[PDB]
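Submission sheet (multi-component)
Chains listed below:
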Amino acid sequence: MNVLVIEDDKVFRGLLEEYLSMKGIKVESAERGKEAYKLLSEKHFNVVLLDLLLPDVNGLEILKWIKERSPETEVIVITGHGTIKTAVEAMKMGAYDFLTKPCMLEEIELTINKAIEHRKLRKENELLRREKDLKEEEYVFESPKMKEILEKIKKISCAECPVLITGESGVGKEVVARLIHKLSDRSKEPFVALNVASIPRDIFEAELFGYEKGAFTGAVSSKEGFFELADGGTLFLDEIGELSLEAQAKLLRVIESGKFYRLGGRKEIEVNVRILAATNRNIKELVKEGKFREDLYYRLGVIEIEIPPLRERKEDIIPLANHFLKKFSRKYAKEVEGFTKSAQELLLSYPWYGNVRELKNVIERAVLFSEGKFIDRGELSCLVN
Amino acid sequence: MNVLVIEDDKVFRGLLEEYLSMKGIKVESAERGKEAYKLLSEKHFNVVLLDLLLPDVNGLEILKWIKERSPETEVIVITGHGTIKTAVEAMKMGAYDFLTKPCMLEEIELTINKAIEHRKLRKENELLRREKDLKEEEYVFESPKMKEILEKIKKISCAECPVLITGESGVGKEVVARLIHKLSDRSKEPFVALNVASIPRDIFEAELFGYEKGAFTGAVSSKEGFFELADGGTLFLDEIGELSLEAQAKLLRVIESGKFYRLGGRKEIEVNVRILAATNRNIKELVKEGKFREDLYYRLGVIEIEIPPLRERKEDIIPLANHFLKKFSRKYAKEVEGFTKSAQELLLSYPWYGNVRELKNVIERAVLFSEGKFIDRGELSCLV
Ligand SMILES: Nc1ncnc2c1ncn2[C@@H]1O[C@H](COP(=O)(O)OP(=O)(O)O)[C@@H](O)[C@H]1O
Ligand SMILES: Nc1ncnc2c1ncn2[C@@H]1O[C@H](COP(=O)(O)OP(=O)(O)O)[C@@H](O)[C@H]1O
Ligand SMILES: [Mg+2]
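Outcome: structure written.
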């Protein structure tokens, strides 16, 4: 980490230089504005200690210069006694915190550490989000059945009640839930996808609801749960039919009161989370067999979206295939432009029991083994029909 | 959001209540320490303004109770003028910040906002991190070939120099980069994976190194790149061959001095990032064709690990196949639990030129198609 100190006071300045020097942080100093601007033009800094009062320039201008160029640089303004208004103005202008010249070295340490933590937290947030953005995909709804399902999704998006998405696996259930959140008034809020079937039943509740210290053996400290962390957002539970009966009851409560207890808790907690659920099974049968609460089935089933197989929407097949063609043609550095005229026929003729997920895997393999500029019916031969 | 105000001074408690009101934040009050304790036992507050000087109790006492019970709670301490020393110790115990009774309403706003931002970033990061842990895979390393590579990795992760991972596609080069990271000294630091081919070249250089205003059409601001974001951690560049000659030059310098300039930049940046690269191609070739710099090639290959194809690691095939069947079976709630003997023999005899990725993709489709308890030779034979 690099720090830039812009102070005129040889005393206070040195104190700063020393402190930073002691913590193992690279430092550079500037006695005046013209020198600070020079350095600021040659080196990127993580933290800048700026004194609002400088001989040749008005500190505030430097702060403004810094904030326009690199908002990622934490900036701490330095001001004297009784100059709190400008410090507050400075902060309103983008300064993170401020130091009063003079002050305890402990104040210097705490203020600088607070700024360092913010930066740490800020970078982590950016990285995880940018990493997530890399995986963003664009969807295809060119079939009548889907074209209208899209419209219904637009109508239910801003509702606060739950949606139950059904259909054969690999049909696009999670995709639909993503759009529901994307088109809703919560879109900028978190979207959490949790597959109930793949997460260990014995860990699921602790993760969804969170737990207090000692609620179960192993629980050394207290941990928040997805419901809390996703507060204000949307929670998507895939394969809802695999929820334990114990878990089903707790879920019905949140859907009813938006309140719940952590495992081993006494304080009731409230959250505002839209719940979206999906299943590729027969829940009605699950209710009869007494494995799935009928009440929950009724509530989740208020708004229901049914996604039909790929077989029942051939208008989607080719478009989706082209989408995947391009996608993988990139990921794997290959020269596949499109599909042979006959190859397209095979695609349309196949039943795609795996549906879109199958369609995806097939094209990805076809593209990975592709030699020419096109994919023949023969290249789909070994892969499907 | 729930906040709890614990102030005895009637005027200051009014300001805090007003500000919290202006913001639309649910508020609750206490004038004496013991009243605070009751409320604190009833509700889970997100932020607490705690005055240090209370008639019956000492603020510090409540501070320690909160930091221990619910650490999740942001605590802002209050204190009179010229009493800084008590506030400093307060922060030394877990208090996020402090206010000075009295002060501008704006001062209260800025401080409270910073505490709300701190909580927001904390929870967002915990969430994004946990959504990632959810996608962690268990890795299968049974063959003796992979067994010894695992051993080599261990001796490597303790070094800081770059590593060039080579091997056919779908062989597990990225899986290996991750293990190198987990076993290294920067395991707790970030690991950033980027596939140079999957991203259009123009968008790539900007993303990796960042850019300064004017670097290209519309770049209205200066932006950090993945290199800065991965600082202190590890960066994995897959399909390293697709790097533009310009990108190669910047990478070279970062490997030599940890310094570089953003795209169209003049404000030097310095990072400490371990570099791991992968390729299924022959760099030596690309060098002669003048497509890849020779010096970078040598710097990246200081340590070079070749990950063999599946057909040369037959011991991994059944273990891999079983792992995948189990994984996709749970994912789709299927009743499949294994492969018939005839199925197993096919998996072992098929050459898997697409390697592990091809195996994974084929088992996924087999599970999607299945409706029984086992996958037979017929379901596989049509897939391969
Ligand atoms: N309309 C679509 N447009 C683009 N891709 C889609 C579409 N529908 C599904 N997919 C892709 O097909 C695969 C099946 O996805 P998914 O929604 O998870 O199905 P399901 O939840 O029913 O098992 C995913 O990789 C997804 O990105
Ligand atoms: N040893 C392993 N155990 C379990 N899964 C593996 C293993 N090796 C690779 N995989 C999986 O195989 C696929 C190929 O992955 P990857 O590392 O990206 O290959 P490569 O980088 O060589 O192209 C991935 O989805 C990965 O999770
Ligand atoms: Mg690869």
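Remark: Residues 1-136 of chain B form a domain with the Rossmann fold fold (CATH 3.40.50.2300).
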